[PDB]
Amino acid sequence: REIVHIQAGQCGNQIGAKFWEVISDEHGIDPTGSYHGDSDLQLERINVYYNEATGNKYVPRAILVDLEPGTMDSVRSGPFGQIFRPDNFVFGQSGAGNNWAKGHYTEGAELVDSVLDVVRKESESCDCLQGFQLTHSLGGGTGSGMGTLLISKIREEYPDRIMNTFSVMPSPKVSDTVVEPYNATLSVHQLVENTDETYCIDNEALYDICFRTLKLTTPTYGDLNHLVSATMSGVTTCLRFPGQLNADLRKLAVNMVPFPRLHFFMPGFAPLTSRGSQQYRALTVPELTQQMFDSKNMMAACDPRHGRYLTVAAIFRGRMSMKEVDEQMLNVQNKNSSYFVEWIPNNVKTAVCDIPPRGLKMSATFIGNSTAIQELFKRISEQFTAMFRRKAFLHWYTGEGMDEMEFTEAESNMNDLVSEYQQYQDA
Amino acid sequence: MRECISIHVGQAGVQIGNACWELYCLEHGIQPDGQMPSDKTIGGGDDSFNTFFSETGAGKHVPRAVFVDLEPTVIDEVRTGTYRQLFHPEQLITGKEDAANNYARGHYTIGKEIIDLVLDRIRKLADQCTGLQGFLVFHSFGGGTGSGFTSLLMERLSVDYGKKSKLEFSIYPAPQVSTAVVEPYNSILTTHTTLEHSDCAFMVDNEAIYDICRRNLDIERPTYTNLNRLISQIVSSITASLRFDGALNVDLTEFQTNLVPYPRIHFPLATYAPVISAEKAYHEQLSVAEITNACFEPANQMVKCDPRHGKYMACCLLYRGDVVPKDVNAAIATIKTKRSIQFVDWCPTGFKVGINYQPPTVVPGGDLAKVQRAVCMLSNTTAIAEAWARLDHKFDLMYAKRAFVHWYVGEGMEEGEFSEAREDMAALEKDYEEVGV
Amino acid sequence: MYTFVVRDENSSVYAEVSRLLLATGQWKRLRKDNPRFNLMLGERNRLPFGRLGHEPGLVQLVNYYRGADKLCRKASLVKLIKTSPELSESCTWFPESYVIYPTREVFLAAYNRRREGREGNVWIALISSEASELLDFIDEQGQVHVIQKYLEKPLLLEPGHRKFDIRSWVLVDHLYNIYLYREGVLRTSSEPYNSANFQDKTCHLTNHCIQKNYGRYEEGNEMFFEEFNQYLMDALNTTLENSILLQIKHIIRSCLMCIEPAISTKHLHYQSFQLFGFDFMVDEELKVWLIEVNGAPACAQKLYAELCQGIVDVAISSVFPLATSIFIKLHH
Amino acid sequence: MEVIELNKCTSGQSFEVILKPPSDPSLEEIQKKLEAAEERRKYQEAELLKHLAE
Ligand SMILES: Nc1nc2c(ncn2[C@@H]2O[C@H](COP(=O)(O)OP(=O)(O)OP(=O)(O)O)[C@@H](O)[C@H]2O)c(=O)[nH]1
Ligand SMILES: Nc1ncnc2c1ncn2[C@@H]1O[C@H](COP(=O)(O)OP(=O)(O)CP(=O)(O)O)[C@@H](O)[C@H]1O
Ligand SMILES: COc1cc(C(=O)c2c[nH]c(-c3c[nH]c4ccccc34)n2)cc2c1OC=CO2
Ligand SMILES: Nc1nc2c(ncn2[C@@H]2O[C@H](COP(=O)(O)OP(=O)(O)O)[C@@H](O)[C@H]2O)c(=O)[nH]1
Ligand SMILES: [Ca+2]
Ligand SMILES: [Mg+2]
Ligand SMILES: [Mg+2]
């Protein structure tokens, strides 16, 4: 059950690069592509993300995409850059200019088919293809505009596979351009229709965690991406390692998504850690459980207590008492049963993995389908109208052929998304 | 002699089948390579164990079994396991993609593409049978394959083998070992579709087995292997009369005769005692009266329910070990005074007893201790409908919002089959009430 | 924190039981159909006992005993006493009773016995002296009815020549301990009893509700145990303990010990307690008779505080602990 | 308590004790429903591909 990885744009390639760094280290694959690992648990499900090359070398099933050569050259220069398959670098030269229209309709349109060719060559090699995961942001042009254009084309060719995305939402606390609410609103409209599961990695949450909890006075993208890679490793453990659940992307959608449009998850991690510095006290299973459900550990700036949980998935990594994990997880639901919908019985699932991530003896990753995620969409929606009611900065988009009416339709579709999440918060 | 074909569907059915066939082999003296030194009729025979095993010219004894899972991981361990020589490769059928916990995907989408192949491998076993009795179908309620494909297969078998009995060993969903949030949907869907095609069904509620493992086997978190070795013990007790010489329950038809007076109410409750741990260094061996009494303790039942607030329609005691009828009648006499055992007015208040002198067999390195005597009671009591109420309520909570229903419609199913399946369930619960009041 | 849910809003008793529990700060009330409760204060009819005891990690308790209806329904009560060897046909504290459905099993044979000596032949359902008067009154309704010997010579308090009934409140906990509330109540008829006119059934029926004279000799036609003990002393030279309460403790013990094997939750996956109200009648020879067992009982206003608090300590906090006794344990 | 129909053998015995006396669809039909579903599937997929075509 192979997964095909796609990272698009500056943000997609940067967090995408760290993901392959992180999980390569967990599976004991070095930059040369060779396995130098202790446990056979590291190789049992290694084919989910890696192609096995002659000489018994491992190649990530990854496609590196961008409309500009800058960041992709950075990836190749980087520590694990040589692990990638050189033919899977698909890039243009013009750049998207933080413009969704450029990524979706004009500059990206020229490059889309070449990417699909590399995607296709990786799919035909797959014994049984689960689907795809895309890393990108929604505030730029390439990851936002071209990524969603890629997602639409992949669904056309693989209508019966899972589409998974790691989508970085924009925040003024960490913003490159005023037009990010436009890029995000246009992308969400697409994600609502063409993705089965998308993890909402909110840059606002990453900032606040770095500023408040990690006491980082001035946080870089590397400090944010340290959180993102920790989350991406955690929400991938059930796929990469053997377990009782025998987890895959389709079963995750079945259990997490009661209604097809409500497929935007609140990720969470515990314990929160700043790069480099390692603390020496392992947590207690009770500590993991409360931090992971704590609003301060959520990677999307939403208040779980302003909503209700439709479904929850928790994964514990480390050597610990599964009996204690059971009790503790059971304790939090019974303690706070008001924040879980009553009409989906047994909507919290817990999995365990023996191997912990680098640097921690025990950790917990949290995946939540909370109706509180509407707060995220409300925030982006408010930033959008503030400019849109004055038509400000629209000329960057209309110059590439877009129409005002497309913005109105995207604005409206997202507002419906918020109404629908509200519907089940009162149900 | 009349052959019985076992069909193991899905992970739960396959892994539970492994436990059973491993236990059948130890009980009959069949080693993992298929040889049975005790069998002096080489290459064939019409002995009681030949109901479940066929013989080759080379003297190997092969299970009259087919294993079918829509995914290869589980049946592949059967291909490389300790009993890999036991099964012919055509007995194990696999696909590449499972049903994703989706009844509709197992029944309609993926099931439609593998049904003809399975029926043909089933036909290959049926062609070795001088007088085929029927089928024993092992599956789960909660799995997409175990629910969706099983009902598909149950319908076809009624078509192709209309004169042969079909018995079920169904695993009823429990959150302590749950694998999907839609398991209530799959249970109701497959029960509704299978109900008329099953002659008798033994439900094992994972909650009950799990707790029995924790309480009586002192296991903090029981594994599937822990549950399955205990389950195979119960299954072996139920099937022993088919594989051993006896006067009671010698054909699948006898199960319907003795346990099922009305066709739809065909879910007998199974209670098993004693479950004693191998780790206990000092054990006191329980008497015939102590183990018979334990059969009326809800903690020893495969489903948790209160038989005191229901009515019996049949009741069998299947003893294994040092038991003689005098002790059984004495235990029944004292128990009848102290217990709330009410029968329906149109059935006699009586027990049908079977005794096999060979005491229960245990797998070496298992968690179950060896006992001098044991019993499995099979009683058809309306109290089992408590399980239907629990399951139907959860179905009602989700279906009220049509949560997850889109996954089913997306495989070609119609919303109407949900309400139709739940109407049948509502009727089932009412039929149990009429009998039980 | 423990959790509980309420599913009977007309429970005066457990209305209090919620308030006292929330006030402990250690109990939180979920909504009706939240399955993840520790305690269920459940409905009166069709309570879903089959659903209790299947929530992993949750010890569930409930304030009703499944199967206790057998004792708390007049039709079943008579069938229970007749058919249980523990009680037997030769039962000396339950008036003659026969169940007659509307469309005479052996009821005729008993009424004809009384024409042999013209003994008192007053029955009840309602009160009549001719069988035809009563029998033609149960078919006029359409449901099951039971007729029982009317205690023609009951005990009357003077001044007033008045009729009463004693209601005792009994609590049975998850251990099947039987707790008898030390405070009882006499529901008194303010009307002077007289056997000439049954159909003026206001001095004959002692229901607090039916006495729509309300408050003459005692408030709310309710006399408490201290008052009734003093009277018995001053009037009859005896006590409530010796002349009455022994027999009540005997009946309460006998009725609940009879049905224990059928309702006990000792080895069950959920647990039961239940408050009962036993209603007794005392004849002129200081003999106590059992009239009805009430599975859904209502307390007297003066005692809600004390009893509902005893319910928490004995039946609830015994299973969900927190950070002399008002009951009398009837031993078995 | 009457014991009845006691049968014995080297493997064991069996008997009955009485405390008290009393007081399918065709193959083509399966083929229709199976194929009706696959069509409802193809219809919904075609609608998807038409919408993508727009
Ligand atoms: N007792 C017992 N229960 C099992 C076992 N395996 C799975 N289950 C239960 O079966 C239910 C899920 O059914 P599965 O057998 O896993 O489903 P499946 O037939 O493989 O179907 P799909 O995987 O969805 O295609 C859950 O309730 C599990 O608890 C087992 O080996 N023993
Ligand atoms: N055999 C009998 N002889 C004389 N009086 C009797 C009697 N049985 C009952 N009574 C009296 O008449 C009334 C009979 O009605 P009944 O006992 O059914 O009312 P009730 O008990 O249903 C009200 P609640 O349920 O609230 O206690 C009793 O209150 C009692 O005072
Ligand atoms: C738990 O975490 C994961 C599970 C699965 C999975 O396949 C899978 C299979 N049954 C379930 C499941 C059953 N009842 C639930 C109630 C709520 C949520 C999930 C479930 N979930 C897959 C994952 C995963 O976490 C990260 C990546 O993929
Ligand atoms: N968390 C995180 N966010 C990023 C990173 N790089 C860019 N972003 C965000 O992505 C948006 C800009 O998108 P970008 O990927 O650079 O544009 P693109 O290359 O045209 O797709 C802004 O909201 C940035 O805050 C990164 O490395 N980490
Ligand atoms: Ca032979
Ligand atoms: Mg940028
Ligand atoms: Mg499977």
- DSSP codes of every residue in B399-426: HHTTTTHHHHHTTT--HHHHHHHHHHHH
* B90 noted as active-site residue: no
What are the angstrom distances between the C-alpha of A410 and each of A105, A187, A265, A385, B224? 15, 8, 20, 11, 49
- CA A388 – CA D3 distance, rounded (Å): 90
Q: Are C182 and C123 part of one and the same domain?
A: no
Q: Are A253 and A181 part of one and the same domain?
A: yes
Listed in sequence order, the residues at least 6 apart from A218 whose beta carbon sits closer than 8 Å to its beta carbon are none
Q: Are A43 and A96 part of one and the same domain?
A: yes
Q: In this structure, is the dihedral angle defined by the CA atoms of residues B210, B211, B217 and B218, taken in order, positive or negative? A: positive
Q: Is there an atom of ligand 2 within 6 Å of C149 CB? A: yes
For C27, what's the count of Cα atoms within 13 Å in the CB-facing half-sphere?
A: 22
Q: Is there an atom of ligand 4 within 6 Å of A221 CB? A: yes
Q: How far is the CA of C206 from the centre of ligand 2 (A)?
A: 7
In terms of Cα–Cα distance, which of B95, B101, B226, B207 is closest to A245?
A: B101
Q: Are C189 and C171 part of one and the same domain?
A: yes
- CA D54 – CA D45 distance, rounded (Å): 14
Q: Are C57 and C144 part of one and the same domain?
A: no
Q: How far is the CA of C92 from the centre of ligand 2 (A)?
A: 18
Q: Measure CA A110 to chain center.
A: 26
Neighboring chain D residues of B346 at a CB cutoff of 8 Å: 22-23
- CA angle centred on A86, ends A82 and A88, rounded to 5°: 120
Give the mutation target among C291, C293, C294 for probing the ligand 2 site: most ligand atoms within 8 A of CB.
Answer: C291
* Cβ B276 vs Cβ B241: under 8 Å: no
Domain boundary among C128, C152, C176: C152
Q: Are A379 and A350 part of one and the same domain?
A: no
B145 known member of a binding site: yes
Determine the residue among B178, B295, B306 to mutate to test chain C binding: the one whose Cβ has the most chain C Cβ atoms within 10 Å: B306
Neighboring chain A residues of C33 at a CB cutoff of 8 Å: 342
3-class SS of residue B178: coil
Question: What does chain B come to in residues?
Answer: 437
- CA C191 – CA B390 distance, rounded (Å): 53
Residue of C nearest to B397 (CA): C33
- CA A56 – CA A125 distance, rounded (Å): 16
Domain boundary among A330, A352, A372: A372
Domain boundary among C112, C133, C152: C152
> Which residue range(s) make up the domain with A144?
1-258
Is C102 exposed, middle or buried, given 0-12, 13-18 or 19+ CB atoms closer than 10 A? middle
- CA A325 – CA A304 distance, rounded (Å): 21
- CA C63 – CA B385 distance, rounded (Å): 23
Give the number of domains in chain C.
3
Q: Are A207 and A274 part of one and the same domain?
A: no
Neighboring chain C residues of A331 at a CB cutoff of 8 Å: 57
Encoded tokens for B282: 């000092």
Q: Are A240 and A344 part of one and the same domain?
A: no
Asked whether at least 3 C-beta pairs link D and C within 8 Å, the reply is: no
* Cβ B13 vs Cβ B40: under 8 Å: no
Domain boundary among A236, A258, A280: A258
What values do phi and psi take at A281, rounded to 5?
-95, 115
Q: How far is the CA of C291 from the centre of ligand 2 (A)?
A: 6
A137 known member of a binding site: yes
- CA B340 – CA C261 distance, rounded (Å): 7
CATH number at residue A396: 1.10.287.600
* Cβ D12 vs Cβ B360: under 8 Å: no
* Cβ B304 vs Cβ C54: under 8 Å: yes
Residue of A nearest to C2 (CA): A335
Q: Are C270 and C293 part of one and the same domain?
A: yes
Neighboring chain A residues of C35 at a CB cutoff of 8 Å: 342, 345
In terms of Cα–Cα distance, which of A253, A255, A249, A224 is closest to A346?
A: A255
Q: Are A58 and A186 part of one and the same domain?
A: yes
Q: Are C267 and C124 part of one and the same domain?
A: no
SS (H, E, C) chain C: CEEEEECCCCCHHHHHHHHHHHCCCCEEECCCCCCCCCEEECCCCCCCHHHCCCCCCCCCEECCCCCHHHCCCHHHHHHHHHHCCCCCCCCCCCCCEEEECCCCCCHHHHHHHHCCCCCCCCEECCCECCHHHHHHHHCCCCCCEEEEECCCCECCECCCCECEEEEEEEEECCCCCEEEECCCEEEECCCCCCCCCCCCCCCCCCCCCCCCCCCCCCHHHEEEHHHHHHHHHHHHCCCHHHHHHHHHHHHHHHHHHHCHHHHCCCCCCCEECEEEEEEEEEECCCCEEEEEEECCCCCCHHHHHHHHHHHHHHHHCCCCCCCCCCEEECCC
Is the CB of residue B98 less than 8 Å away from at least one CB of chain C? no
Q: Are C201 and C73 part of one and the same domain?
A: yes
- CA C290 – CA C296 distance, rounded (Å): 17
Instruction: Give the atom of ligand 2 at the shortest distance from the alpha carbon of C95.
Output: 1
What values do phi and psi take at B222, rounded to 5?
-65, 145
> How many C-beta atoms surround the C-beta of residue C319 within 10 A?
17
Q: Measure CA B174 to chain center.
A: 16
Is the CB of residue D52 less than 8 Å away from at least one CB of chain B? no
- Subunits adjacent to chain A (3 or more Cβ pairs under 8 Å): B, C, D
Listed in sequence order, the residues at least 6 apart from B126 whose beta carbon sits closer than 8 Å to its beta carbon are B5, B132, B161
Q: Is there an atom of ligand 3 within 6 Å of A133 CB? A: no
H helices of B295-345, in order, are 325-338
Q: How far is the CA of C148 from the centre of ligand 2 (A)?
A: 10
- CA B135 – CA B120 distance, rounded (Å): 15
Nearest CA to ligand 2 atom 3: C150
Q: Are C81 and C110 part of one and the same domain?
A: no
Q: Are A89 and A202 part of one and the same domain?
A: yes
Is the CB of residue A346 less than 8 Å away from at least one CB of chain C? no
- CA C165 – CA C150 distance, rounded (Å): 14
Q: Are C245 and C331 part of one and the same domain?
A: yes
Neighboring chain B residues of C50 at a CB cutoff of 8 Å: 305, 385-386, 389-390
> How many C-beta atoms surround the C-beta of residue C28 within 10 A?
16
A222 known member of a binding site: no
Encoded tokens for B356: 């096999």
- CA B55 – CA B43 distance, rounded (Å): 5
Q: How far is the CA of A391 from the centre of ligand 7 (A)?
A: 54
Q: Are C42 and C107 part of one and the same domain?
A: no
Q: How far is the CA of B180 from the centre of ligand 3 (A)?
A: 8
- Ligand number nearest CA of B46 is 5
Q: Are C144 and C237 part of one and the same domain?
A: no
3-state helix, strand, coil in chain B (%, to 5): 45, 20, 35
What are the angstrom distances between the C-alpha of C124 and each of B30, B372, C149, C301? 75, 60, 7, 29
Residue B381 DSSP code: E
What are the angstrom distances between the C-alpha of C207 and each of B306, B308, B418, C146, C204? 37, 35, 51, 18, 9
- CA angle centred on B186, ends B182 and B188, rounded to 5°: 115
Cα R_g (chain A), whole angstroms: 20
What domains lie within chain B, and their CATH numbers?
1-268 (3.40.50.1440), 269-383 (3.30.1330.20), 384-437 (1.10.287.600)
Closest to C36 (Cβ–Cβ): which among A326, A327, A333? Answer: A333
3-class SS of residue B325: helix
Q: Are C164 and C233 part of one and the same domain?
A: yes
Q: What is the resolution of this structure in A?
A: 2.9
Q: Is there an atom of ligand 4 within 6 Å of A9 CB? A: yes
Domain boundary among A199, A223, A258: A258
Give the number of domains in chain A.
3
Residue of C nearest to A335 (CA): C1
Is the CB of residue C302 less than 8 Å away from at least one CB of chain B? no
CATH number at residue C90: 3.30.470.20
CATH number at residue C27: 3.40.50.11480
Q: Are C83 and C177 part of one and the same domain?
A: yes
Residue that is written with structure tokens 């005896």 in the block: C238
- CA B344 – CA C329 distance, rounded (Å): 38
Residue A372 DSSP code: G
How determined? X-ray
Listed in sequence order, the residues at least 6 apart from B369 whose beta carbon sits closer than 8 Å to its beta carbon are B276, B277, B278, B280, B283, B362
Determine the residue among D4, D16, D38 to mutate to test chain B binding: the one whose Cβ has the most chain B Cβ atoms within 10 Å: D16
Check CB contact under 8 Å for B340 and C261.
yes
Q: Could you write out the DSSP letters of every residue in B354-369? A: EEESSPPP--TT-SBP
Instruction: Give the atom of ligand 4 at the shortest distance from the alpha carbon of A201.
Output: 1
Is the CB of residue A330 less than 8 Å away from at least one CB of chain C? yes
Q: Are A322 and A423 part of one and the same domain?
A: no
Is the CB of residue A404 less than 8 Å away from at least one CB of chain B? no
Neighboring chain D residues of A159 at a CB cutoff of 8 Å: 45, 48-49
What are the angstrom distances between the C-alpha of A182 and each of A148, A201, A393? 14, 18, 9
> Which residue range(s) make up the domain with C55?
1-63
Give the mutation target among C279, C282, C283, C299 for probing the ligand 2 site: most ligand atoms within 8 A of CB.
Answer: C279
- Subunits adjacent to chain C (3 or more Cβ pairs under 8 Å): A, B
